[PDB]
Nucleic acid binder design. Sequence first.
DNA 1: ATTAGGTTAGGCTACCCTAAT
DNA 2: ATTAGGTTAGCCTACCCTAAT
Lengths: 175, 175, 173, 219
Amino acid sequence: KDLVDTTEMYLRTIYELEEEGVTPLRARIAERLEQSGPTVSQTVARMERDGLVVVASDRSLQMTPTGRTLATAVMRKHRLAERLLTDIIGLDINKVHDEACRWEHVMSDEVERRLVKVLKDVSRSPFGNPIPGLDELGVIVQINEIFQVETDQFTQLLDADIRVELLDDLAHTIR
Amino acid sequence: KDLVDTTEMYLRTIYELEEEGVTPLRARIAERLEQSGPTVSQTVARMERDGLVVVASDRSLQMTPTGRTLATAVMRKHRLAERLLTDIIGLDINKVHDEACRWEHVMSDEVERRLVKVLKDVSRSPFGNPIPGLDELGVVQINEIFQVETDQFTQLLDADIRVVELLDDLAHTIR
Amino acid sequence: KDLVDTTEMYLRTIYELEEEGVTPLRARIAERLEQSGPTVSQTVARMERDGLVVVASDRSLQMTPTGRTLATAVMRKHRLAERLLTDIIGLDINKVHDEACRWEHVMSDEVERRLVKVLKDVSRSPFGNPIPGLDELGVIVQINEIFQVETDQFTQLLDAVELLDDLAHTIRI
Amino acid sequence: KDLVDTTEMYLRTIYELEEEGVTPLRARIAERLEQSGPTVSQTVARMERDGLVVVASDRSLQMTPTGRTLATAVMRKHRLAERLLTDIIGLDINKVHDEACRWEHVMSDEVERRLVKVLKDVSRSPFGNPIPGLDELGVAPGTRVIDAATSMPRKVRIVQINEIFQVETDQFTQLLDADIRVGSEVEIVDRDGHITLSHNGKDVELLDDLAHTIRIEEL
DNA sequence: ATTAGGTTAGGCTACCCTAAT
DNA sequence: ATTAGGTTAGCCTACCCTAAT
Ligand SMILES: [Co+2]
Ligand SMILES: [Co+2]
Ligand SMILES: [Co+2]
Ligand SMILES: [Co+2]
Ligand SMILES: [Co+2]
Ligand SMILES: [Co+2]
Ligand SMILES: [Co+2]
Ligand SMILES: [Co+2]
């Protein structure tokens, strides 16, 4: 419980939802980030005030171009870190996602570029998630980021040697 | 300007001052961290309230054992990160200290251990600073304060110096 | 800890400060009502949004006519209740101010008027505080409202003492 | 629209329902306090969470002993306030119930006791509703009207007006205007479907739902 | 009565600041 | 440093609601 950077985790979340094909709703962010309703609605307002996102007429969250850009950069940083964490540092595969969930917020663009070089392929994350917005950087198919967080159900997935019945909610999670 | 974790950078700074042989004074933290006087005196009060440090009868800051412990862990994380950034990632040497000033607050104990393994020697930081509290982990030199002084440090790098006239303040910086 | 009606107790407080001759500052409200700084600053913003008060260029609180009006009505209701509580109900004199601090927020204009009738004089509260705005209703000198709250120092006053430098400007005469 | 204290008004309401012999259901509270379905269900949850009441297997609301104790103290506070309001303050009889519905939530146990002293009898409220839990404070039933009416009318004495009726404005003000007060000698019939009272040649037709909310005597 | 998704009012702490003591 | 007074981000709870089940 410490998003490190709240705004970033909110945008990464919207991004994620989009990835999973779900409609970005304040409610989503709420449950996903385990934050109170009023809370997320407020933090989101702040965001909108900073032209990072806009709550549509239908309550859906449309990241502004600028908000979108950042959301992406974060997703990219996340997956890149995961790759380095596993490929190079060789950190335990379960802890990898969490560690990255933190680093995504403190990794510079340079370090990112350096990683591109030092890393073999940078197509996808260790979990098969395609690493985004690399163009801009100036340089089973996959288990969605949302599943990677589901520890209990994920380790049950790892106990099966997967690179097991999934909760109806986690259904649309593994592409 | 974003300590990432205020308390940590506060303790790491007290630690650092001790290193340079300076007396840890609220005043130091203030200038070093470019923060208002009242601000630091209050943040510190918070710390004291959390038995992380105590303001001596002589206004000096004495980290409690527990505060001391964390202070150490942070410095450790810092230098460890620096080594990885340079040795492995190969990130530009000037940017190295800053990136680490960030990572130190989001690097887990595990990744640290993994680093110990993947890294050659972990005696000192790329700047010659002795990596501390490795014992506890369960597994000459340009002071940290100089590494921040970009202009004066790059003037130091323009002279090809690895582990001229330095500001009287930066004097006790290079041991 | 339950203002019953926040906005009211905020206004009544600004009124009170004015009475004691103190400059109404968010800071005052905070300490007086034992509420966080950010909290009172926000609740006040709400008030200002409802044209009940405005934060001066010098950070002082100037109740708008409307705000002022309400603030007064509250103070009036408070003292009237106190009188009723002591004179008619005969409730213990220390508990009186507290009970009133509650009733002030749920007493109607009518009840007030009825009270004026049933009560002897309604010049001041049992604590000598002059009952205000009896006109819109259409109808030792005194221990300030702020002192009536200081239980320990007040009962020492009832046991009759030296008053805290802060509570100094509290008892007029 | 401002219960002053939500929890209290909810409990007082369950209390009331029990009094009128109605089954305490979330639905009742909803209509009675004009609050959305979801709303009351949730506020009740909170209550249950605070062991104030429990939603039976049959969806009925059973106040825990603690919840019950509070409900009672509120009803007591209400009726005591009403008495003071009328007997002492002499506030208009219609405004009396509303003022009380507010005061009930801010009147101390002490003030209550003082009232007991200052007040003559404290058997019932100005509307004939018996003041409860005077024991905790530490200090006969009439026939529902709906039961006394007949095809052929009869004179009878108003003995009780339930707290629920006092809220039915058009309905309450109406009776209050026929100059009907507790003690009035009134006439009552079951004329083609509905029950009606007549005090001063004035006739007041009771809503079928309210017919139960008025206890009667026999002169 | 519940599921789904919001809301406002009112309150809080951590952390940061300028001016005047 | 401290007094004095205030500020933003980030959070929570008690309560209320409508649309759709
Ligand atoms: Co991940
Ligand atoms: Co994260
Ligand atoms: Co360094
Ligand atoms: Co740092
Ligand atoms: Co008073
Ligand atoms: Co009050
Ligand atoms: Co009543
Ligand atoms: Co009520």
